[PDB]
Design a protein around this motif. Structure first.
Motif, PDB file in Angstrom:
ATOM      1  N   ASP A  20       0.877  -1.346   0.150  1.00  0.00           N
ATOM      2  CA  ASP A  20       0.054   0.031   0.038  1.00  0.00           C
ATOM      3  C   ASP A  20       0.844   1.413   0.098  1.00  0.00           C
ATOM      4  OD1 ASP A  20       0.481  -0.454   2.738  1.00  0.00           O
ATOM      5  OD2 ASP A  20      -1.428   0.292   3.494  1.00  0.00           O
ATOM      6  N   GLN A  21       1.918   1.458   0.772  1.00  0.00           N
ATOM      7  CA  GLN A  21       2.637   2.359   1.003  1.00  0.00           C
ATOM      8  C   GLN A  21       3.510   2.604  -0.501  1.00  0.00           C
ATOM      9  OE1 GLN A  21       3.735   3.689   4.678  1.00  0.00           O
ATOM     10  NE2 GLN A  21       3.132   1.825   5.756  1.00  0.00           N
ATOM     11  N   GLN A  22       4.031   1.302  -1.020  1.00  0.00           N
ATOM     12  CA  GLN A  22       4.873   1.437  -2.351  1.00  0.00           C
ATOM     13  C   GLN A  22       4.142   2.123  -3.285  1.00  0.00           C
ATOM     14  OE1 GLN A  22       5.727  -2.885  -2.749  1.00  0.00           O
ATOM     15  NE2 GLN A  22       7.812  -2.617  -2.872  1.00  0.00           N
ATOM     16  N   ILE A  23       2.651   1.871  -3.566  1.00  0.00           N
ATOM     17  CA  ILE A  23       1.790   2.339  -4.285  1.00  0.00           C
ATOM     18  C   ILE A  23       1.516   3.941  -4.360  1.00  0.00           C
ATOM     19  CG2 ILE A  23      -0.602   2.520  -5.281  1.00  0.00           C
ATOM     20  CD1 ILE A  23      -0.804  -0.649  -5.196  1.00  0.00           C
ATOM     21  N   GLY A  24       1.556   4.212  -2.749  1.00  0.00           N
ATOM     22  CA  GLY A  24       1.340   5.477  -2.451  1.00  0.00           C
ATOM     23  C   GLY A  24       2.580   6.492  -2.725  1.00  0.00           C
ATOM     24  N   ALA A  25       3.746   5.794  -2.450  1.00  0.00           N
ATOM     25  CA  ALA A  25       4.989   6.451  -2.875  1.00  0.00           C
ATOM     26  C   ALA A  25       4.960   6.584  -4.299  1.00  0.00           C
ATOM     27  CB  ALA A  25       6.214   5.600  -2.293  1.00  0.00           C
ATOM     28  N   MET A  26       4.822   5.532  -5.104  1.00  0.00           N
ATOM     29  CA  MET A  26       4.640   5.814  -6.646  1.00  0.00           C
ATOM     30  C   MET A  26       3.563   6.755  -7.123  1.00  0.00           C
ATOM     31  SD  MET A  26       4.899   1.698  -7.646  1.00  0.00           S
ATOM     32  CE  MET A  26       5.194   1.687  -9.385  1.00  0.00           C
ATOM     33  N   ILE A  27       2.502   6.986  -6.664  1.00  0.00           N
ATOM     34  CA  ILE A  27       1.623   8.047  -6.816  1.00  0.00           C
ATOM     35  C   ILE A  27       2.452   9.277  -6.676  1.00  0.00           C
ATOM     36  CG2 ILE A  27      -0.508   9.287  -6.151  1.00  0.00           C
ATOM     37  CD1 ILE A  27      -1.656   6.387  -5.480  1.00  0.00           C
ATOM     38  N   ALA A  28       2.885   9.592  -5.478  1.00  0.00           N
ATOM     39  CA  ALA A  28       3.616  10.754  -5.334  1.00  0.00           C
ATOM     40  C   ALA A  28       4.734  11.209  -6.233  1.00  0.00           C
ATOM     41  CB  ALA A  28       4.160  10.766  -3.913  1.00  0.00           C
ATOM     42  N   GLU A  29       5.503   9.739  -6.567  1.00  0.00           N
ATOM     43  CA  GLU A  29       6.579  10.183  -7.403  1.00  0.00           C
ATOM     44  C   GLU A  29       6.081  10.056  -8.990  1.00  0.00           C
ATOM     45  OE1 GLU A  29       8.848   6.811  -6.378  1.00  0.00           O
ATOM     46  OE2 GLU A  29       9.356   7.698  -4.372  1.00  0.00           O
ATOM     47  N   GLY A  30       4.786  10.149  -9.383  1.00  0.00           N
ATOM     48  CA  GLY A  30       4.139  10.237 -10.786  1.00  0.00           C
ATOM     49  C   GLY A  30       4.438   9.021 -11.590  1.00  0.00           C
ATOM     50  N   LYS A  31       4.527   7.955 -10.671  1.00  0.00           N
ATOM     51  CA  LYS A  31       4.806   6.767 -11.367  1.00  0.00           C
ATOM     52  C   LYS A  31       3.418   5.861 -11.495  1.00  0.00           C
ATOM     53  CE  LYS A  31       9.765   6.166 -10.206  1.00  0.00           C
ATOM     54  NZ  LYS A  31      10.410   5.893  -8.862  1.00  0.00           N
ATOM     55  N   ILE A  32       2.324   6.144 -10.960  1.00  0.00           N
ATOM     56  CA  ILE A  32       1.234   5.903 -11.024  1.00  0.00           C
ATOM     57  C   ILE A  32       0.396   6.952 -11.143  1.00  0.00           C
ATOM     58  CG2 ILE A  32      -0.878   4.690  -9.737  1.00  0.00           C
ATOM     59  CD1 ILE A  32       1.289   2.640 -10.588  1.00  0.00           C
ATOM     60  N   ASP A  33      -0.587   6.872 -12.176  1.00  0.00           N
ATOM     61  CA  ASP A  33      -1.647   8.020 -12.374  1.00  0.00           C
ATOM     62  C   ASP A  33      -3.077   7.725 -12.699  1.00  0.00           C
ATOM     63  OD1 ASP A  33      -1.588   6.831 -15.146  1.00  0.00           O
ATOM     64  OD2 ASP A  33      -0.437   8.417 -15.750  1.00  0.00           O
ATOM     65  N   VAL A  34      -3.552   6.597 -12.290  1.00  0.00           N
ATOM     66  CA  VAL A  34      -4.876   6.193 -12.025  1.00  0.00           C
ATOM     67  C   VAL A  34      -4.923   5.140 -10.927  1.00  0.00           C
ATOM     68  CG1 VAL A  34      -7.056   4.948 -13.065  1.00  0.00           C
ATOM     69  CG2 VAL A  34      -5.339   6.222 -14.570  1.00  0.00           C
ATOM     70  N   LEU A  35      -5.786   5.257  -9.891  1.00  0.00           N
ATOM     71  CA  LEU A  35      -5.987   4.085  -8.695  1.00  0.00           C
ATOM     72  C   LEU A  35      -7.440   3.485  -9.017  1.00  0.00           C
ATOM     73  CD1 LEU A  35      -5.344   2.721  -6.118  1.00  0.00           C
ATOM     74  CD2 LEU A  35      -6.212   4.831  -5.042  1.00  0.00           C
ATOM     75  N   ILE A  36      -7.481   2.191  -9.260  1.00  0.00           N
ATOM     76  CA  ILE A  36      -8.626   1.422  -9.301  1.00  0.00           C
ATOM     77  C   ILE A  36      -8.852   0.512  -7.812  1.00  0.00           C
ATOM     78  CG2 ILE A  36     -10.344  -0.114 -10.208  1.00  0.00           C
ATOM     79  CD1 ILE A  36      -9.702   1.906 -12.103  1.00  0.00           C
ATOM     80  N   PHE A  37      -9.402   0.766  -6.956  1.00  0.00           N
ATOM     81  CA  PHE A  37      -9.385   0.193  -5.357  1.00  0.00           C
ATOM     82  C   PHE A  37     -10.937  -0.300  -5.301  1.00  0.00           C
ATOM     83  CE2 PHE A  37      -7.445   0.952  -1.164  1.00  0.00           C
ATOM     84  CZ  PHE A  37      -7.766  -0.415  -0.509  1.00  0.00           C
ATOM     85  N   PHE A  38     -11.331  -1.659  -5.445  1.00  0.00           N
ATOM     86  CA  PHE A  38     -12.638  -2.207  -4.737  1.00  0.00           C
ATOM     87  C   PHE A  38     -12.309  -2.725  -3.616  1.00  0.00           C
ATOM     88  CE2 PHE A  38     -14.328  -4.015  -9.206  1.00  0.00           C
ATOM     89  CZ  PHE A  38     -13.905  -2.746 -10.016  1.00  0.00           C
ATOM     90  N   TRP A  39     -13.327  -2.040  -2.679  1.00  0.00           N
ATOM     91  CA  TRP A  39     -13.126  -2.241  -1.053  1.00  0.00           C
ATOM     92  C   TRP A  39     -14.311  -2.681  -0.754  1.00  0.00           C
ATOM     93  CZ3 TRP A  39     -15.030   1.114   2.663  1.00  0.00           C
ATOM     94  CH2 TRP A  39     -15.879   2.324   2.317  1.00  0.00           C
ATOM     95  N   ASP A  40     -14.378  -3.290   0.703  1.00  0.00           N
ATOM     96  CA  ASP A  40     -15.446  -3.842   1.418  1.00  0.00           C
ATOM     97  C   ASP A  40     -16.002  -2.822   2.522  1.00  0.00           C
ATOM     98  OD1 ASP A  40     -17.424  -5.435   2.925  1.00  0.00           O
ATOM     99  OD2 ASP A  40     -15.584  -7.100   3.075  1.00  0.00           O
ATOM    100  N   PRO A  41     -17.503  -2.258   2.084  1.00  0.00           N
ATOM    101  CA  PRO A  41     -17.765  -1.208   3.048  1.00  0.00           C
ATOM    102  C   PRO A  41     -18.599  -1.792   4.429  1.00  0.00           C
ATOM    103  CG  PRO A  41     -19.486  -1.417   1.303  1.00  0.00           C
ATOM    104  CD  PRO A  41     -18.451  -2.409   0.959  1.00  0.00           C
TER     105      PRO A  41
END
Ligand SMILES: [Cl-]
Ligand SMILES: [Cl-]
Ligand SMILES: [Cl-]
Ligand SMILES: [Cl-]
Ligand SMILES: [Cl-]
Ligand SMILES: [Cl-]
Lengths: 156, 156, 156, 156, 156, 156
Positions: free
Chosen positions: B71-92
């Motif tokens: 989760d933190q790898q992905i968050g770091a990559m967003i901030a670094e410009g390495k990910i530019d779309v997030l698709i997250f299906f979660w359990d409400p």
């Protein structure tokens, strides 16, 4: 799940973090412990990093500003073994709206069982332990084994 | 603070995440939208990624298990410009204790204003937009300037 | 629990919400997208609503102020099908003490699987999807079946 | 902000809620206090209400299941002046993942300063007070004025 | 787990707490209810305590300042039976960074099932119940039995 | 606010706490470090303490079960100067619903700046530091002064 005995290196990779109203405190702590800290490799979130360099001539690798992704960069580094001591001075009374979340960082540090100081007195014990400058043994819980058993059960 | 404009690329770097009880749902969604997703670069947390490789033969870059630092790898990559779309299906309704924290990832996606689908229907709108396959303009709020000035007044 | 295929209407019922430091941003977004938005029915929390009417001559149904019950009014409307698109611009860095809770709203939107924009770039993808102005198909998880099985087990 | 006085009616509109492991406790409490509760208008989340109808033949207005939007229906009704007493028996030790969130409901009950029982003994004091069956005076803090002025300084 | 019938004393031990922007409100409430409150034993967190003594000549036992440990002192007192009524006026809209956490206190009060007022109208019902000045019966859930069964299961 | 210096004693008063799935880990740690821990005064929440007495014949002062008020007893004792080291092994992956809250205890340990181990390796550094068995200097931030002045401006 298994508890494994794992050996850790003599030279440490230390992340230095401070909430805004603890920044001058962290500066002072670092300033009384320069001799020992200069034997290890040091990282900081962006603004704390700049302060250390600017007020101490300290050599530190600077990540992004904590509230702008620096906190996740350091958490990822913990999970990849690239940080193995966390020093985080934090504001227990009047924290800023943007002050870095302590929980997520202490959590990933506990997953990987690394030394953590979240009080300044804890940091003084850490830095004076013979284990600071020596190889030492640590117990790693097999959280991966536990997690996968659980996930498979849900997913079938 | 100032709001300024950044043009984003035609080819997206897409992070795919699902809570355990949503893993099969995301697999069915990816399977139904392959023609379009195959035009883009795909990333996933550990177990969701293996499942996609196994079941669909999909070329996905696998990160660590979400609860163990992915989760933190992905968050770091967003901030670094390495990910530019997030698709997250979660359990409400019934999330597991270890289920990946939704807030920290949406927080960092919002700082960097990238498109986010945290419902399946949002995902169907995203992937069908003409902006999925073209370049588009995004507004980036100058958070670093504001932050820096607030930190200054506190440390002063 | 079952996943049902459900058809959704061409004309949407859109809730427009903004944290205080995002209000002018929401205003501007609405102002560039007036033509499309004017084809659907629009709602807002009390103060954002007034701003839109006052700065744009926009026709919007105003609920109570978000922190004084407007957030629960809109959540209830989601659960009754009276809102089916959520646009919520929020402050990821310096939120006010009273700024509306994002969690509860995104949660009830996920229960009912409606389109949600929580970044401005997400809103630009949403508003340009052909599904915005057309009937479309959505998957509704049978959360009621799941919940009742669990409740009966506890209660006996 | 100003504090002003509102007179409340003799006949109350009472919301009854129980976490799953407290459902039988609330049934026993309602059953023991029927003579008094029968003088008032009674409301309940979906499953708690059915249980009361089934076991006691009580005339209760049933709302949606709490975790599927009934909680927000009730919060909206408090803010609208449609509910003026909240009785909520909750699980302080082992709550289920879906168990209704206590904070958001007590928040909105406090904004509108209505009587709240979140312990069984508090409920016995409420129902025995002479104010249960008479009109009484409540202080309403002028939250709309303060809020409006704060929002203004931010948007300005 | 068992529900036990337990008798409670005529003379109460009342903790009086207020968030900063509710302190003058609590003062006023106490001032209209002096006659009844003076029949019971009274405690307060440090600063609220000083205010009462200073503005009313009230006799109250003062604990530490709420944010500096006074909240845990009073929670411990609840768990030891040394406080058995909680009056806590709190700020649902603009709370200070340091304002005492409502959750932990209401939680331990629910574990021990004591009367709690978290709205001023609730306090007016409490103070006028005949049970305020009389012995009364309360139901104590056997949370200890429940907890130990669970702990043994995990630990083996 | 002012930062001032307090000298701490050679003999420590140590609180030992473990989440249910960490109970056996803490028992193994205490068992391996007995020579040193036997020089100090030891305290524990209810079930962790019994387990230590039973398995190791250790003289530990037992408090209430953590989830039933022992956590707050310990927090009160930290604030009162009765505990000056906290060792807390916690579950970062799969905590039980009742598992003791980590935040409130670390908050109060930080207010009073005492050494804290929330990882096992941190504990090995603490117990090996020469400051474990000597007196040492700690910095105490004057939180009471700042707090008092902030409360004043609000109440005024
Ligand atoms: Cl500290
Ligand atoms: Cl969904
Ligand atoms: Cl945005
Ligand atoms: Cl209760
Ligand atoms: Cl109130
Ligand atoms: Cl550990």
């Amino acid at each position: 799940p298994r508890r494994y005995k794992i050996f850790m290196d003599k030279k440490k990779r230390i992340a230095l973090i401070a909430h805004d109203r603890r920044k001058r405190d962290l500066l002072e702590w670092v300033s009384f412990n320069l001799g020992t800290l200069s034997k290890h490799e040091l990282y900081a979130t962006g603004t704390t990093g700049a302060l250390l360099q600017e007020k101490l001539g300290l050599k530190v690798h600077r990540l992004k500003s904590g509230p702008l992704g620096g906190d996740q960069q350091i958490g990822a580094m913990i999970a990849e073994g690239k940080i193995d001591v966390l020093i985080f001075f934090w504001d227990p009374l009047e924290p800023q709206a943007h002050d870095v979340d302590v929980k997520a960082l202490i959590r990933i540090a506990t997953v990987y069982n690394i030394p953590v100081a979240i009080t300044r007195s804890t940091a003084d014990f850490l830095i004076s332990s013979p284990l600071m400058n020596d190889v030492y043994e640590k117990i790693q819980i097999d959280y991966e084994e536990e997690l996968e058993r659980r996930i498979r059960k849900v997913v079938e």
